[model samples]
Target: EPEMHFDLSSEPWLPVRFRDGRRSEVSLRDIFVLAHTIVGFDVDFPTLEPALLRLVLALAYRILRGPKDDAEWGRLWEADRFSEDAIDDYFARWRHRFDLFSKEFPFFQVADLEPAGKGGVKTANSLVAYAPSTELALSPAEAARWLVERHAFGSASDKTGAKGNPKVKGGKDTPAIGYLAWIGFVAPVGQTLRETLLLNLVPWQYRNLIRGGEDDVPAWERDPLGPTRVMRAPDGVCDLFTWQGRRIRLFPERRGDAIVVPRVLICAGDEVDRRAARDVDPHVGWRMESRRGAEVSYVPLRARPGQQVWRGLSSVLALGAEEQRAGVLSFVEGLQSRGIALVSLLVTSAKFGNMSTTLDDLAYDRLDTPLAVLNQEDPAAATVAIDAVTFAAHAAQALGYVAEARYLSYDLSFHEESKRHRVPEGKAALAKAARSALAEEIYGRLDAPYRHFLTGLANIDDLERPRAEWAALVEAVARDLASRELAQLAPAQAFAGVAGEDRFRRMLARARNEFSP
Candidate 1:
């Protein structure tokens, strides 16, 4: 090859188009706008840029596997309302830059890539250049090898007889010959660069091919034409017996028998869906309807393999958010450490945004300045404290008070188990005490409000029972704190303001007197 010279950095930056049709220079910061448009979240530049680029590459691969018509491309961009001119302009700039890079790296190539015939689009194996000299090449044979490795079955193979016989050990077959044959068949020719590029790109093409197979399922297996049964496990824990029709034990060598039955069965209305066929080894019975006393049950047929289960857990969990938040906050507070306290406070505040101002005020006022208490310690401790203070400030701005709650919840969960003895004993203990006291105080203040929220959410006619129960727990904790029983315990710094003796007493009084029967 002629001494290739690519200059990707020299490529001119294109203008970015906004949703309202305004255009501006595409800076690194402007990349976030593209990310937010695609994913609906603000992107952290440099950190998420590489991952974002990979995602873009994957999407580009999918687009390449479709009909390369203007109409199709127009429809894809229309989803984001990117004007055709803008899209073309952006891609033109990107292509120029990519070509320049490819000239130096020789990354792009044309191989005998198979096209998934969805809309007459062909797949091509592209070399992925990791560095100036190293590349990962992909080919069709390597794609087939990946499919086999992932245990994917293709429409080309029939169910009958041996379906693509895999190499096995301890057989009469010659092992080394089989192994070498398999390796040679998948290997790419020429330099190590060629082999690497082939290996990397083939797996990606293989995945696209398998996805194409999803659309090619026999017409009889498509949607309403297929079985509409819902499988249910009695205990809700689906094991091999319930899901796979066979159970195997490793400790005891036992050969489990497969349940032989029709993979898909159809029956007329009012008839038994599953019937016990005398010829079948495993007897199956399905009743359309069953009556117990005055109640009637309509059990659907068992779902066929690979059916997706309905999702209901999220709505169920959403019903108990307050209780879960309170429980998590309490659990974190009990740890009695500065780091845990700081993290828990951040997390709780992030979750509800109710405590963001309070946290910000305290961190800026008490913890932001280099402390006489923490100055003698390791420089790392000072850095951590500074980071914590800085984070509190940014968190206030980024999340605001209202939106910080969810983030606070997540942060508390993330750092719940981190080590926290890096600072001086007094500072660390104070931090721990603060967190514990704050949890107790916040629980007291918001306990009634939370109960009211939950009661309204549950839509119960009478809220007295749950309200009284939760109120009692809050009262008990308050009374305990007021009695100075918890003062001796180590406090978490995150809860610093409320973990104090005076704060606990005040909270107890408020909880006891605020709600009246």
Candidate 2:
């Protein structure tokens, strides 16, 4: 059997570092990292972090104490050891200090800046934003673009002339001139070159080039007509602004445009309005309705009246011939002893559509013999032979030994007449009996080989032990008969006509008197 190993590396109780230089802490980020690593390495949650930490500490200690060269670092990186002593020793030294250092500078932590609300998480210090593909619905690109725009303009207030030049008029020309004057006064550039440079930078600044506007922002955040300013309100109205203080009018004045901010939808976070062209629909109420009806035809019913009918039918079909009835009963009894109850027998015949009956009726059907065959043999001999044949057949059937049952039943019936006749007690008879006994012994051994042979034949592992055990018992009886051991008899002959063939043969061969005389 293959040994099973558990990885306890990512157990939740394990400590993780935080940004505040704490020795131990646990956060959602650690939980997510543990989950991700568990999935990535195909290791169970139990062994994940503990095993990983052992290796990590070993490498950290080696790096701290060794030559402090790239080669030594590489050697430590590739080393793999799970020894407790090594791990503890490494941790006792500078490895603990490294972990403490990592609190201030975690090897793995959430990036400093991430998109808020609809915007996906991003690396905190990374300028890169997560922009999902546009083909997907509710793409993150719009949110990312909004953040970029906000960052570039300093704030929505800055873009609306909220902080600069109160004296200038709220229009394109005045704001442009005022902006140049502010830049000239604040910048280190000389007065002579300021005008020339201001003129050159004006269009670019209006288009948001130097500080990155619509054209310069990443593709994710390139919406030119998106909102620049948001307002907190009870009725959901936000104001938008151009570089000057003026607001663009997209709706007619009569539509209550001032309070409503016509043509704009209030998105809580940073999401773009794609359905601006459509009218808002009113919400509809829904209700749940329950009704009773006849069960569906294909639906399966359990523990119902139909199941009792099926069980009744099954018990009737399982009972075999009269001589086999006793064996069948024993088999049922064995199953019952093992906690398996035999409920009923079900049989299907050409004359009957489907019949449900008791076990006794089925057992009686198996016992009845044909008139022609009964006329050919004496009562005693015929009874013995029939019993043997029926026992083998019923046992095999119960155990699903279709092919072997058929073979044994046919062979026993074929040799029944000759086997019943008187035999002389001499060297020849003894030798024949001995050879027959050897054959029986060899046949008994075949059960082991047969079991091994059939292992690949079945999809399931059940039914094997019962079949082998019953077959072995039958072989043992045959062996005893072949060696002239008539005293060896099973306590009960459950089937009427079933007889031990080997026992009969052995008795006839060793008898001092012949019954024929």
Candidate 3:
């Protein structure tokens, strides 16, 4: 009966875990104040965790007024917690914008939005891809979190048209995914939430040059965005972090003393140039696609399903001279150069499906990455690390090829026709399945030992010794796995092997040479 209000600054909407092994929800205001005691975000969807972290980073950036250089950032790191005084003062100035249901201005939504059709009005289920239907209703807290998730990582398919917004057309069309969804996001986690934020906070001077502006501000500080879609370039880092991917309005229903968001209206919002976004975005890794005479092309390094993050260490570490390292990784490298050696990093990302419309799976991994690997000045260390990873990858591939060949040896169904230029589909699929299964197995077995190899690289002087040690370990593991697999082969398979391919013995010998130190 009364006017609805959900102030994000005071509402317990963001879920987080604490160092004391407790999980709870807290308000945006408390996130910074209690950041020291907190571990990290605890959310159901993997994408939401990074999305929330970026939001917090944007707020800190605006309130702190650009810890403009390294020393300023170092000062904050030493403080161990964000300044509650500054946070209070900053929120006081923008108090109205924090309210989720404010009539004049809603948090991250156009307050004047209206539904264009039946498709435009749906239950909160539409905000999330995992939810099945409107049979379920979300509490305000749950809806709030999903609302943020949709903005950062919503599907590009099945978009709705909003009424009264001039951008609305006659029918719905599949649009581009959210800005964050365009890349595989990475975040560095420290012992506590305070350290994590400091580690990720890039120097203002450093980021200013890339964003093409010295004045960086979040959306809340600026005038509210209109309902119609606007194509614009991001102003700065915080601007990119808080970019509005969609215009959304939530319709809530009060039940007893509580409120549930039973309906919501969502449509397209600002559209950003993908390349420019990649340029200013701090968290995602990148690779150079190609270079014409003067122009260079780069693309986001995406996370792959069923693949471990460390498997892509080359990209994360900027192993090659051509690689455009992630801005956050570059910042960590700067910290290490200044003797701030953090122990590890948390690499997280969402793999999208169906033309980048739906989230397929989330890849979450933590590597005990040493400063040695991150140090760009030490080319030898970077080379050694990437070489070891490459060797391990080759060994894995060798195991896969050997396993596939052996399996084909056993299949009488695989005849000369199966080996022809155009192999039978059935036999080809069988071979692929066998190879993929073996690749997964070998990578699983190598995961822990490989991490130890990385951590050990920190204090080593002669990179050769560490490189050889890793090589020996991989060689032994590969030989052992091959022996076990080959011994299981039937006697007939050994004699009736696929022509023009290595037999079990030859493949095993090749793997030995492949890992020779």
Using alpha carbons, what is the TM-score of model 1? Answer: 0.18
List per-prediction Cα lDDT, in the order shown. 0.24, 0.24, 0.75
Tens-digit per-residue lDDT, 1-517, candidate 1: 2323322222223233444454543332233225223222122221122222222222232323332333443354334332335434444444432322132221121112111122212121211111111122222222212211111111111111111113212211111111101110111111121111111122212221111211222111122111112222211111100111100000101123311111110111011112111111011112235667976443212212111111111111112222111111222222223121122011000011222111111000001111111222323323332232222222222212111111111124244422221234435555455444444353445434432333232223343454454446545544444334344333343332233343434544443343323
TM-score of 2: 0.13
Models ranked on TM-score: 3, 1, 2
Query: In model 3, which regions exceed 4 Å deviation?
Result: 131-133, 207-214, 337-339, 349-356, 400-402, 405-429, 496-516
Q: Which ten residues in a row have the lowest lDDT in candidate 1?
A: 343-352
Find the candidate with the highest TM-score and give its number.
3
In order of appearance, the predictions have TM-scores of 0.18, 0.13, 0.89
Residue 233 C-alpha lDDT in model 3: 81
Better of 1 and 3 by lDDT: 3
